Design an enzyme around this catalytic site. Structure first.
Site, PDB file in Angstrom:
ATOM      1  N   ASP A  50       0.961  -1.048   0.061  1.00  0.00           N
ATOM      2  CA  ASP A  50       0.152   0.053   0.015  1.00  0.00           C
ATOM      3  C   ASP A  50       0.575   1.165   0.014  1.00  0.00           C
ATOM      4  OD1 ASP A  50      -1.969   1.958   0.547  1.00  0.00           O
ATOM      5  OD2 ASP A  50      -2.952   1.098   2.071  1.00  0.00           O
ATOM      6  N   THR A  51       1.120   2.015  -1.300  1.00  0.00           N
ATOM      7  CA  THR A  51       1.939   3.270  -1.172  1.00  0.00           C
ATOM      8  C   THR A  51       0.991   4.075  -0.639  1.00  0.00           C
ATOM      9  OG1 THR A  51       0.887   3.525  -3.503  1.00  0.00           O
ATOM     10  CG2 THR A  51       2.888   2.351  -3.110  1.00  0.00           C
ATOM     11  N   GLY A  52      -0.031   4.030  -0.214  1.00  0.00           N
ATOM     12  CA  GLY A  52      -0.975   5.179   0.234  1.00  0.00           C
ATOM     13  C   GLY A  52      -0.896   5.060   1.827  1.00  0.00           C
TER      14      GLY A  52
END
Ligand SMILES: [Cl-]
Ligand SMILES: [Cl-]
Ligand SMILES: [Cl-]
Ligand code: NA
Lengths: 99, 5, 99
Positions: free
Chosen positions: C25-27
């Site tokens: 999850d880059t968020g």
């Protein structure tokens, strides 16, 4: 570009004729933008995560420019603390995770 | 589903 | 590897000798795992998402293998909808976003 993850991967987008900052979010199925008007029809949707669910408006066939790459898809509008570009549009700009 | 700060 | 985003980017992780599935999850600033036992002391942390903020348990210097790559770092434990690998460990395994 190749974007490292030392910092939040924020990029400039163009949507509804407006320039905004947004987070490239591989953990998001959907694209979610802060309250704004968009053209056409919409329908209600609930989306959730940590903390619970929130009601949003679902707009289809919206065009967005993402760091210079145009894409079209569904955009959700609602009370999000950060504009999020989710997988439905990351795919369209050919974004991949690499390690 | 969508996704933390 | 190069992971496209047509599907959720789910990988296998190993933590506490146990295999689990988790989302790259880059968020997410931080890594958050479902309730489980980890060693050592924890400290309090609040994390926020689209629906609000929640209390989690912060464990530092936890050994976790992600898609075959070893990381040692901070793992949060709490009521997450899915196990999430956030940027603090994505950087350790050398992941970048590319388009
Ligand atoms: Cl879409
Ligand atoms: Cl592709
Ligand atoms: Cl860490
Ligand atoms: Na529409």
């Amino acid at each position: 570009p190749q974007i490292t993850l030392w910092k939040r991967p924020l990029v400039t987008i163009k949507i509804g004729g407006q320039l905004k900052e947004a987070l490239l979010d591989t953990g998001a199925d959907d694209t979610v933008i802060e309250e704004m008007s968009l053209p056409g029809r919409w329908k209600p949707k609930m989306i959730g995560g940590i903390g619970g669910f929130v009601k949003v408006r679902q707009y289809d066939q919206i065009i967005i420019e993402i760091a210079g790459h145009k894409a079209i898809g569904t955009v959700l509008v609602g009370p999000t603390p950060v504009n999020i570009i989710g997988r439905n549009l990351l795919t369209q700009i050919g974004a991949t995770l690499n390690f | 589903n969508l996704x933390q700060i």
